[PDB]
DNA sequence: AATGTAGTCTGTTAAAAACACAACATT
DNA sequence: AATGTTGTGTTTTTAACAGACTACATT
Protein backbone atom coordinates (compact mmCIF):
# COMPACT_ATOMS: atom_id res chain seq x y z
CA UNK A 1 0.00 0.00 0.00
CA UNK A 2 2.95 2.13 0.53
CA UNK A 3 4.50 3.78 -2.87
CA UNK A 4 8.12 3.91 -1.60
CA UNK A 5 8.92 0.26 0.05
CA UNK A 6 13.00 -1.59 0.40
CA UNK A 7 13.59 -5.07 0.78
CA UNK A 8 9.62 -8.46 3.33
CA UNK A 9 8.62 -5.18 1.99
CA UNK A 10 9.41 -2.51 4.34
CA UNK A 11 8.37 1.40 3.77
CA UNK A 12 11.47 4.12 3.49
CA UNK A 13 9.81 5.81 6.67
CA UNK A 14 10.78 2.79 8.25
CA UNK A 15 14.29 2.86 6.94
CA UNK A 16 14.78 6.68 8.40
CA UNK A 17 13.43 6.00 11.49
CA UNK A 18 15.85 3.05 12.23
CA UNK A 19 18.81 5.61 11.08
CA UNK A 20 17.85 8.30 13.46
CA UNK A 21 17.10 5.87 16.61
CA UNK A 22 21.02 4.78 15.84
CA UNK A 23 22.00 8.27 15.13
CA UNK A 24 20.47 9.68 18.37
CA UNK A 25 22.93 6.15 20.36
CA UNK A 26 25.80 7.44 18.88
CA UNK A 27 25.98 10.97 20.05
CA UNK A 28 28.37 11.12 22.65
CA UNK A 29 27.34 13.90 24.67
CA UNK A 30 27.70 16.12 21.11
CA UNK A 31 25.08 18.99 20.13
CA UNK A 32 22.92 19.07 17.35
CA UNK A 33 22.60 21.74 15.49
CA UNK A 34 21.73 21.08 11.29
CA UNK A 35 19.81 17.78 12.20
CA UNK A 36 17.65 18.78 8.56
CA UNK A 37 20.27 19.34 5.86
CA UNK A 38 21.98 16.40 7.34
CA UNK A 39 19.21 13.95 6.40
CA UNK A 40 17.96 16.15 3.23
CA UNK A 41 21.27 15.90 1.66
CA UNK A 42 21.60 12.39 2.09
CA UNK A 43 17.70 12.02 0.58
CA UNK A 44 18.31 14.19 -2.36
CA UNK A 45 21.51 13.13 -3.47
CA UNK A 46 20.35 9.41 -4.44
CA UNK A 47 16.44 11.03 -5.77
CA UNK A 48 18.40 13.19 -8.10
CA UNK A 49 20.50 9.78 -8.95
CA UNK A 50 17.14 8.34 -9.70
CA UNK A 51 15.23 10.52 -11.92
CA UNK A 52 18.56 11.48 -13.85
CA UNK A 53 19.24 7.72 -14.68
CA UNK A 54 15.29 7.28 -15.43
CA UNK A 55 15.08 10.37 -17.74
CA UNK A 56 18.65 9.59 -19.08
CA UNK A 57 19.86 12.86 -18.17
CA UNK A 58 17.04 14.63 -19.59
CA UNK A 59 16.68 17.56 -16.75
CA UNK A 60 13.20 18.94 -18.22
CA UNK A 61 11.82 15.55 -17.70
CA UNK A 62 13.32 14.74 -14.07
CA UNK A 63 12.66 18.51 -13.42
CA UNK A 64 8.62 17.67 -14.33
CA UNK A 65 8.78 14.25 -12.69
CA UNK A 66 9.27 15.67 -9.17
CA UNK A 67 7.04 18.32 -9.62
CA UNK A 68 10.00 21.27 -9.28
CA UNK A 69 11.19 24.43 -11.15
CA UNK A 70 13.55 23.37 -13.55
CA UNK A 71 15.54 25.96 -12.27
CA UNK A 72 15.23 24.09 -9.07
CA UNK A 73 16.62 21.05 -10.12
CA UNK A 74 19.17 22.85 -11.75
CA UNK A 75 20.44 24.51 -8.48
CA UNK A 76 20.08 21.27 -6.45
CA UNK A 77 21.84 19.48 -9.08
CA UNK A 78 25.16 22.20 -8.56
CA UNK A 79 24.57 21.33 -5.21
CA UNK A 80 25.66 17.95 -4.56
CA UNK A 81 28.31 18.29 -7.62
CA UNK A 82 25.97 16.97 -10.21
CA UNK A 83 27.15 18.90 -13.27
CA UNK B 1 32.43 42.61 13.55
CA UNK B 2 28.74 42.44 13.94
CA UNK B 3 26.72 39.11 14.78
CA UNK B 4 23.17 37.88 15.21
CA UNK B 5 21.70 37.27 17.93
CA UNK B 6 21.68 33.88 17.34
CA UNK B 7 25.44 33.96 16.83
CA UNK B 8 26.28 36.25 19.96
CA UNK B 9 24.31 34.24 22.12
CA UNK B 10 26.51 31.27 21.39
CA UNK B 11 29.56 33.07 22.46
CA UNK B 12 28.25 34.27 25.96
CA UNK B 13 29.41 32.77 29.05
CA UNK B 14 25.69 31.31 29.72
CA UNK B 15 23.84 30.89 26.44
CA UNK B 16 20.29 31.93 27.36
CA UNK B 17 16.73 30.83 24.74
CA UNK B 18 16.18 33.00 22.21
CA UNK B 19 12.91 34.67 23.38
CA UNK B 20 14.91 35.95 27.00
CA UNK B 21 17.73 37.74 24.50
CA UNK B 22 15.21 39.05 22.59
CA UNK B 23 13.42 40.35 25.41
CA UNK B 24 16.59 41.97 26.48
CA UNK B 25 17.49 43.95 23.57
CA UNK B 26 13.64 45.24 23.97
CA UNK B 27 14.36 46.13 27.68
CA UNK B 28 17.66 47.93 26.64
CA UNK B 29 19.63 45.57 29.00
CA UNK B 30 22.10 45.04 26.19
CA UNK B 31 25.20 47.85 25.84
CA UNK B 32 25.43 48.80 22.86
CA UNK B 33 22.01 48.27 21.94
CA UNK B 34 22.02 46.51 18.33
CA UNK B 35 20.61 48.00 15.48
CA UNK B 36 17.70 45.97 13.46
CA UNK B 37 18.78 46.12 9.75
CA UNK B 38 15.69 44.16 7.79
CA UNK B 39 14.52 41.64 10.01
CA UNK B 40 17.27 40.62 12.50
CA UNK B 41 19.46 42.38 14.77
CA UNK B 42 23.04 42.74 14.42
CA UNK B 43 25.35 42.79 17.83
CA UNK B 44 28.24 43.89 18.59
CA UNK B 45 31.21 41.78 19.34
CA UNK B 46 32.23 43.83 22.72
CA UNK B 47 28.09 43.48 23.68
CA UNK B 48 27.37 42.57 26.71
CA UNK B 49 24.35 42.47 29.54
CA UNK B 50 24.55 45.76 31.53
CA UNK B 51 22.70 44.89 34.69
CA UNK B 52 19.83 47.46 35.76
CA UNK C 1 32.12 7.08 8.16
CA UNK C 2 28.74 7.87 7.62
CA UNK C 3 27.14 9.57 9.71
CA UNK C 4 23.25 7.84 9.23
CA UNK C 5 23.08 4.68 8.23
CA UNK C 6 20.46 1.05 9.05
CA UNK C 7 21.02 -1.97 10.34
CA UNK C 8 20.83 -4.53 7.90
CA UNK C 9 24.65 -7.51 9.71
CA UNK C 10 26.28 -4.46 7.91
CA UNK C 11 25.78 -0.88 8.50
CA UNK C 12 24.21 0.42 5.36
CA UNK C 13 24.30 4.26 4.44
CA UNK C 14 20.53 5.61 4.34
CA UNK C 15 21.33 6.90 0.86
CA UNK C 16 21.65 3.34 -0.06
CA UNK C 17 17.81 2.68 1.56
CA UNK C 18 16.71 5.57 -0.58
CA UNK C 19 18.14 4.65 -3.79
CA UNK C 20 16.75 0.80 -3.48
CA UNK C 21 13.43 1.94 -2.79
CA UNK C 22 13.16 4.16 -6.01
CA UNK C 23 14.57 1.45 -7.91
CA UNK C 24 11.77 -0.20 -6.40
CA UNK C 25 8.95 2.43 -6.90
CA UNK C 26 10.35 2.88 -10.56
CA UNK C 27 10.04 -0.92 -11.51
CA UNK C 28 6.38 -0.92 -10.11
CA UNK C 29 5.63 2.15 -12.78
CA UNK C 30 2.95 0.58 -15.09
CA UNK C 31 3.43 3.15 -17.41
CA UNK C 32 1.90 5.35 -15.47
CA UNK C 33 2.92 9.64 -15.15
CA UNK C 34 4.54 10.64 -11.96
CA UNK C 35 4.69 14.13 -11.33
CA UNK C 36 5.36 15.45 -7.96
CA UNK C 37 7.99 12.72 -7.00
CA UNK C 38 9.63 15.27 -4.83
CA UNK C 39 7.11 15.82 -2.37
CA UNK C 40 5.96 11.84 -2.54
CA UNK C 41 9.23 11.22 -1.08
CA UNK C 42 10.12 14.48 1.03
CA UNK C 43 6.56 13.84 2.83
CA UNK C 44 7.76 9.86 3.32
CA UNK C 45 11.16 11.43 4.98
CA UNK C 46 9.74 14.51 6.69
CA UNK C 47 7.15 12.68 8.95
CA UNK C 48 9.59 9.95 10.03
CA UNK C 49 12.48 12.77 10.97
CA UNK C 50 9.86 14.37 12.84
CA UNK C 51 8.62 11.96 15.11
CA UNK C 52 12.02 10.85 15.89
CA UNK C 53 13.53 14.95 17.37
CA UNK C 54 10.54 15.56 19.10
CA UNK C 55 10.42 12.05 20.72
CA UNK C 56 14.51 13.15 21.76
CA UNK C 57 13.07 16.29 22.95
CA UNK C 58 10.13 15.20 24.95
CA UNK C 59 7.80 17.25 22.87
CA UNK C 60 10.00 20.17 23.37
CA UNK C 61 8.88 22.35 20.21
CA UNK C 62 12.30 24.90 20.25
CA UNK C 63 14.32 22.26 21.31
CA UNK C 64 13.69 20.10 18.63
CA UNK C 65 13.68 23.19 15.92
CA UNK C 66 17.17 24.54 17.38
CA UNK C 67 18.00 20.95 17.09
CA UNK C 68 17.63 20.87 12.93
CA UNK C 69 18.52 23.75 12.48
CA UNK C 70 15.27 25.14 11.65
CA UNK C 71 12.86 28.29 12.42
CA UNK C 72 10.36 27.40 15.08
CA UNK C 73 7.56 28.51 12.90
CA UNK C 74 8.09 26.40 9.87
CA UNK C 75 8.69 23.31 12.72
CA UNK C 76 4.98 24.29 13.71
CA UNK C 77 3.93 24.33 10.65
CA UNK C 78 5.75 21.07 9.27
CA UNK C 79 4.33 19.73 12.33
CA UNK C 80 0.71 20.75 11.26
CA UNK C 81 1.36 19.59 7.93
CA UNK C 82 2.23 15.74 8.95
CA UNK C 83 -0.96 16.12 11.44
CA UNK C 84 1.10 16.31 14.75
CA UNK C 85 -0.62 18.23 16.90
C1' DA D 1 12.55 37.18 40.06
C1' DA D 2 14.39 35.53 35.98
C1' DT D 3 14.13 32.49 32.55
C1' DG D 4 11.75 28.93 29.40
C1' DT D 5 7.86 27.52 26.34
C1' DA D 6 3.64 27.38 23.38
C1' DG D 7 0.81 29.79 20.78
C1' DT D 8 -0.31 33.64 17.84
C1' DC D 9 0.90 37.37 15.53
C1' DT D 10 3.70 40.72 12.71
C1' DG D 11 7.56 42.55 9.34
C1' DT D 12 11.50 41.14 5.98
C1' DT D 13 13.73 38.35 2.53
C1' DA D 14 15.50 34.26 0.27
C1' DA D 15 14.02 30.29 -2.23
C1' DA D 16 11.13 28.84 -5.75
C1' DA D 17 8.45 29.69 -9.13
C1' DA D 18 6.83 31.29 -13.95
C1' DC D 19 8.48 33.06 -18.35
C1' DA D 20 11.19 34.24 -22.01
C1' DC D 21 14.56 32.93 -25.56
C1' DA D 22 18.59 32.31 -28.49
C1' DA D 23 21.53 28.64 -28.65
C1' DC D 24 22.38 23.63 -29.49
C1' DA D 25 20.20 18.81 -29.71
C1' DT D 26 17.26 15.36 -30.76
C1' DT D 27 13.66 13.12 -33.44
C1' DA E 1 13.14 20.22 -41.43
C1' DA E 2 10.65 20.07 -37.57
C1' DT E 3 10.65 19.81 -32.57
C1' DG E 4 12.54 19.33 -27.91
C1' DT E 5 16.35 20.79 -24.48
C1' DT E 6 19.74 23.34 -22.66
C1' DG E 7 21.72 27.50 -20.82
C1' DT E 8 20.60 31.70 -18.62
C1' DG E 9 18.54 35.54 -18.01
C1' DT E 10 14.46 38.17 -16.19
C1' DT E 11 10.15 38.99 -12.98
C1' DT E 12 6.72 37.34 -10.12
C1' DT E 13 5.29 34.32 -6.27
C1' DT E 14 5.80 31.19 -2.35
C1' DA E 15 7.97 29.78 1.97
C1' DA E 16 11.35 30.50 5.37
C1' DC E 17 12.98 33.68 8.33
C1' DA E 18 13.73 36.84 12.85
C1' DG E 19 11.09 38.93 15.93
C1' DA E 20 7.01 40.72 19.16
C1' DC E 21 4.30 39.51 22.94
C1' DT E 22 1.11 37.20 26.15
C1' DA E 23 -0.31 33.59 29.26
C1' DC E 24 1.62 30.00 31.74
C1' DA E 25 5.50 26.85 33.33
C1' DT E 26 10.04 25.95 34.89
C1' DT E 27 14.29 27.20 37.19
Known sequence: ????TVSTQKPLRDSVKQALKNYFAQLNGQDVNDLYELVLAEVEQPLLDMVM?????????????????????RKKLKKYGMN | ??????????????????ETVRRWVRESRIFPPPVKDGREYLFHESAVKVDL
Do not use: H, K
Open chain 1, 1 to 4: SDVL
Open chain 1, 53 to 73: QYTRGNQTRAALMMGINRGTL
Open chain 2, 1 to 18: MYLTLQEWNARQRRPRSL
